[PDB]
Subunit: 334 residues, 4 copies
């Protein structure tokens, strides 16, 4: 099923308590949504499906391009699909900067508030406010106001301090201001994308230098502010730029309270890879060549997109294993 | 918008009265649905989106494969999308044989009956019963019963007499039995896929030999049964196997009361064609070659699927022109 | 074997007397030479292998690019190969304009004169002087001098009046001047590339408009000058731009004394076509992909170049059939 | 120029004295010969071009396949080409087993004996007898007889003890028998392909385990037999299976008297690699697609084969650097 707010809060609470995390897979379509959920199910794992602003715009079609429309259309698709799987799937929206709040996060929040309102559950179970491009006090002012609105709609807010590369490098002051403005969950659950050298994309395995100790110190700074024991983990962290990371980097981040790792680039490669192979091996079936009419069985989009789906699903199971949520779905279907 | 039952009945009535037809485009995904609707809109045309049993199963994902689930999920996606376009879009299900009625058409009908029931409109605006593989009397017994159920749910039934190739060749007796069992619309609107040498797929332009005069004689046989003038067109015909047809064959069929032409193979080729081109020209970006890491900007599925969508949309505008429904949307947005 | 001068003169004399012609295939390499000769042999036909200035430069390698070197190296290769076939193969050099005479035709002629000289046969059996870019009187002054040198070396000269496209359109005056300056073979055999709308390359079958009647009138103009019967054919014509021609155009040209048709573009396509197919179907063998090491058996150049050779040979047999020299080799191996 | 026997003997003597070696590049065509020589020249290096039995058969064309013909035709091509470069190029024939001696090595030897005979130099400067599949005494009986014939024709003989993989692993007894039967050059220069775990082909960099100490001990065994100081290097070794070797393995082998390293697989990959890339990026130029006529400029074989040649040349310069013969041509063109 779709994760109810209560099961999503339980998911994140269990992950944190047990030092594991959930993959948050960026999807753009019926096929990628299907591939992601099948990956979660194959791994016996709960998971998160997220739509970026560009993914939602793509979802709405070239004749719309409207973020809300694409996010709603894909969310309604996903609600029908996820009901047929025995794992919990949460819906999330990814990075939304200040000038897109009015055309993405706020309207989607208002849609969920009205559902809630009528005794139903929200359409999405979390939304991201990415205020990292504005000064921290303004980021956190907007965050505080959005947190109240999200909590009232049974929705978890994700926020960001520090910029994810495409400085890097969240400061002590920012961690302290965050706890001061928002508390530690008593005013509504929030997820914190604190940056620690993360980069969106995949580079040669040497190139991206992560500093997970930044997360460890953020936990200590918060625990001190809250008068907690020094090993407490008051933040639920989000690891952006997950694709291309070393296993050891993922493991270390899990130790410091990462409960959600975002992956897009690697599942993109996984999806595309057998489509590429299909076109090459079937070149004279997918092209009308030398006066011939091609071969319908290989230019039928389903022929290669089933292969794309299965391949993306396999990469999603790898993410569930890497993050240690495989075999741990709160539905306990073993 | 999605076509209400009343506007769908008006669409088909207008098409018939004016000897034009609507394309019924087989879709399998968010992308193909988006491409089809954009094609209708670009042509200033109303249109039909249909899901085959295999398309619905594909729509539900490899971890489901359930026809109803895939059809419902794609229909809910389409409802959100179509609200953002100023043309009318009808949802249809394609060929359903006897042994799939209980797992496709009947459950979808029951879903629409309950919506109707609560004062709403049906989820799909028509469903196909393909009884061509059973004797005509059994075909038409099932048809009569389904027509009553469909009409009660504000849904148009499509039926088939004769087999579409992949004998061909609907008989006089079958036309007469059809009018006798079902009447001419007074007991509920139905669409008749009478076969006349149609073949699903595309072959070298010489190969498929259509006999539209079969449709002309079916109209005369019916008009005689109904005691109508000899030029009356009591049937609303469906042209299966539309891809690869000559313009002149399409024109002749329109003269005899074809109001709906099914196209799948040609929009498949149109969708796939630039994906093929994208993989070849970007071979060293979509593959990780010689120790390199590929190029995210070209293995991002959206990079080639936007090109697939636009290309399929162009082929859908061609179908609206070929069928003379371009520029004729009942919304009159000019 | 390589055609001796006497058998090459007999070849051209027989072709003319019987209204057939030989393909003159442009080659650039050991593989293309092998493909051309195998094509002649497979068709039971004699034939001509020719090297253009750019083909000879390519033949000499990127570290040389020297026309004479490439032509000599490829000619020596061909001498060894052709000795193993039971058809006659003539070696020719293609278009040489005025500013390349000193670095191509003249040095090659001097090489053959020295062989002849020592009681041997020339290295090439014909050379082309392409003077079509200079005024006709200068063209024919150079031609007369070259004809004397070529005849003394047992070599046939090809000349050109009119430009082959890439005006078109040889004039009556040019035909008359040619016979006046050079006679009709008594002063040494020459081949005349008279242009009649020929174009090098291949375009959509509609595009190139040939005017073979130009050749018919050139024969009549010459026969009148020589005081011969009006049906005499004093010229041995060369058909440039043979690729992409209609069969009917080829047939008509043969009626007017064409004894040699040049083909390059079509045998290029034939050679390349299965190399293309080989790379696509074996994409993950010819590329080192996803950390793998490729597959030697498919990146071995011989794997695809054997397929290229056989395919080019097949196109050369088609040319022997089109030109009616198939089955007519003067060796009479049946 | 082509290496005279005297300069080839000087080449090998200099390489041995200075612990460097020459690449022996397998070629199959005019293009690969051109690429190899340009590579030697670009590296300021002398080098060896070799033809295997299958390369010679391929060289002769599908209508011949005759080893002697292909080897002679390619050797005559190479003689013309190599005269235009300021480095020395030696011609060699690769592995010839017992049942091909009568149809490859022996006839080629007889051709060189007749040239020598008339006061000229041999056509090839070395030939390989591969007797590794027969017992050592028979191998060396044939070797002794061939060495006499080769030396009389001014030709160096290469022999093999141990099998190159596609046991591995030349024995002390075999080294001693070799020196006993053939001496150490006083009866004619020979090259010894002693095997030490070499494998033809390229595998993942981990897989092939070379044991160069086998060569070191073979030198000591020979030096002891000859009553020489223990650091003497009586054998001139040949390193088969050079492609895919680590630099450190190549360096170690050079220390023990390797003067010739055979490379084929890596120069195959280098040649093919840009042909592959050319076909993908120009897919709609090398194929006639969607009723179009392709693009001559990219299906002209020279368009991609010039790129193949330059790429293979670059890999040959890498081999000259790896083997430390770069910058050392005995022509001293700096
Ligand atoms: O903007 P997208 O759709 O490329 O995806 C966004 C995330 O993956 C990282 O910004
Ligand atoms: O079964 P599909 O999905 O290939 O499509 C069905 C129609 O297009 C014709 O049967
Ligand atoms: O110059 P090339 O090598 O392209 O060939 C020349 C002829 O085929 C026509 O000019
Ligand atoms: O037989 P080839 O032509 O594949 O080449 C032979 C050598 O490279 C190793 O046996
Ligand atoms: Na990343
Ligand atoms: Na069709
Ligand atoms: Na042409
Ligand atoms: Na090797
Ligand atoms: Zn991100
Ligand atoms: Zn459990
Ligand atoms: Zn159909
Ligand atoms: Zn209007
Ligand atoms: Zn020409
Ligand atoms: Zn005969
Ligand atoms: Zn070898
Ligand atoms: Zn020097």
């Amino acid at each position: 099923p779709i994760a109810t707010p209560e099961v999503y809060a339980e998911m994140l609470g269990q992950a944190k308590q047990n030092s594991y995390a959930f993959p948050a897979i960026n999807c753009t379509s019926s096929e990628t949504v299907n591939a992601a959920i099948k990956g979660f199910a194959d791994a016996g794992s709960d998971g998160i499906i997220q739509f970026s602003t560009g993914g939602a715009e793509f979802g709405s079609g070239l004749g719309v391009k409207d973020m809300v429309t694409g996010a709603v259309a894909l969310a309604e698709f996903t609600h029908v699909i996820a009901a047929k799987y025995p794992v919990n799937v949460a819906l999330h929206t990814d990075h939304c900067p200040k000038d897109k709040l009015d055309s993405y996060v706020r309207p989607l929040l208002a849609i969920s508030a009205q559902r809630v309102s009528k005794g139903g559950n929200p359409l999405f179970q979390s939304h991201m406010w990415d205020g990292s491009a504005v000064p921290i006090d303004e980021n956190l002012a907007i965050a505080q106001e959005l947190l109240k609105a999200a909590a009232a709609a049974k929705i978890i807010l994700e926020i960001e301090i520090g910029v994810v590369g495409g400085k890097l490098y969240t400061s002590p002051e920012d961690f302290e201001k965050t706890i001061e403005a928002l508390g530690a969950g008593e005013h509504g659950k929030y997820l914190l994308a604190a940056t620690f050298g993360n980069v969106h994309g995949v580079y040669k395995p040497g190139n991206v230098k992560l500093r997970p100790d930044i997360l460890a110190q953020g936990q200590q700074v918060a625990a001190a502010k809250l008068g907690l024991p020094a090993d407490a983990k008051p933040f639920d962290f989000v690891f952006h730029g997950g694709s291309g990371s070393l296993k050891s980097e993922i493991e270390e981040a899990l130790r410091y309270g990462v409960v959600k790792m975002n992956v897009d680039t690697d599942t993109q490669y996984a999806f595309t890879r057998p489509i590429a192979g299909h076109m090459f091996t079937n070149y004279d079936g997918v092209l009308k060549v030398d006066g011939e009419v091609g071969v319908k069985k290989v230019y039928d989009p389903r022929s290669y997109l089933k292969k794309a789906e299965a391949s993306m699903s396999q990469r999603v199971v790898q993410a569930c294993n890497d993050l240690h949520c495989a075999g741990k779905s709160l539905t306990h279907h073993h």
